């Protein structure tokens, strides 16, 4: 399958006292492997997957230095943007940044990205071609002119097409026993009477990885969305994911309904039907 390496950064200003809160997390696919939190005691990038622990001190020192440099950039940006938007010094603001790279099933570079938001709104982002920027407003346009003159896109493109995928490949090999295996959903259907005349069927998908999944209900082999409920895919806390979907049906007609489960770990989709 295809794979991704992504880094997510959040900085939130603290007008009352001190410097911004800064939180950085790194993922391979849906697996968190590192974190940095400015409030944590270590002041180091920290491992969050066993496979990254085999990297040596020079890796950890370099990642700590770089992550701190990201924190400082975000601090400066919170000040600059407060000025660009004519905002008071009294309020707390937020910057969010995400970037990363994907490789295809062929293990070659597939795409890169780099996106930045201010106060939860798009600010500036690299276009798919990795050569130009999308600026949402005149403040971001000013940033775009700066970055164009500094050849920021050229340097990022070199990282995204080169370094980023080389390291993603390295992590994929070192973490292979988890990162290159799929956990197919463990599925189950429950039944509840909700009145004298209706029942709710709930289709469960448990313990799956990666998080992407499709759960759909069919009545007599046609997709049904009315009278259904879906929850957001949620983390189990052990590295896997959970989801369910439910449908209300006339009592006695349960057998007309099937729940269809599609996942990377399932070579053919699963179909569940209430009979017993």
């Amino acid at each position: 399958g295809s794979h991704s390496m992504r880094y997510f950064f959040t900085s939130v200003s603290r007008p009352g006292r001190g410097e911004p809160r800064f939180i950085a997390v790194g993922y391979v696919d849906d697996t968190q492997f590192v974190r940095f939190d400015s409030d944590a005691a270590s002041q180091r990038m920290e491992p969050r997957a066993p496979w990254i622990e085999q990297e040596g001190p020079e890796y950890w020192d370099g990642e700590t230095r770089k992550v701190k440099a990201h924190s400082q950039t975000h601090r400066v940006d919170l000040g600059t943007l407060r000025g660009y938007y004519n905002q008071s010094e009294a309020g707390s603001h937020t910057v969010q940044r995400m970037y990363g790279c994907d490789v295809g099933s062929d293990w070659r570079f597939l795409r890169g990205y780099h996106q930045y938001a201010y106060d939860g709104k798009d600010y500036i982002a690299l276009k798919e071609d990795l050569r130009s920027w999308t600026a949402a407003d005149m403040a971001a346009q000013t940033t775009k002119h700066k970055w164009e003159a500094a050849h920021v896109a050229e340097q990022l493109r070199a990282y995204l097409e080169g370094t980023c995928v080389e390291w993603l490949r390295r992590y994929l090999e070192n973490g292979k026993e988890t990162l290159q295996r799929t956990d197919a959903p463990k599925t189950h259907m429950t039944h509840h009477a909700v009145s004298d005349h209706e029942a709710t069927l709930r289709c469960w998908a448990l313990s799956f990885y990666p998080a992407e999944i499709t759960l759909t209900w069919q009545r007599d082999g046609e997709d049904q969305t009315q009278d259904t409920e879906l929850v957001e895919t949620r983390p189990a806390g052990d590295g896997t994911f959970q989801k369910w979907a439910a449908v209300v049906v006339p009592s006695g007609q349960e057998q007309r309904y099937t729940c269809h489960v599609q996942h990377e770990g399932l070579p053919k989709p699963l179909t569940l039907r209430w009979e017993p």
């Binding site: 880094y7 790194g26 890796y59 990642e63 770089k66 992550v67 440099a69 990201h70 950039t73 975000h74 400066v76 940006d77 600059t80 943007l81 940044r97 970037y99 930045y116 600010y123 500036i124 940033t143 700066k146 970055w147 500094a150 920021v152 340097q155 990022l156 990282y159 370094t163 980023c164 390291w167």
Partner: peptide, 9 residues
């Protein structure tokens, strides 16, 4: 592996 030099906005 992080990118080394985030430029200010």
């Amino acid at each position: 592996y992080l990118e080394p030099a985030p430029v200010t906005a």
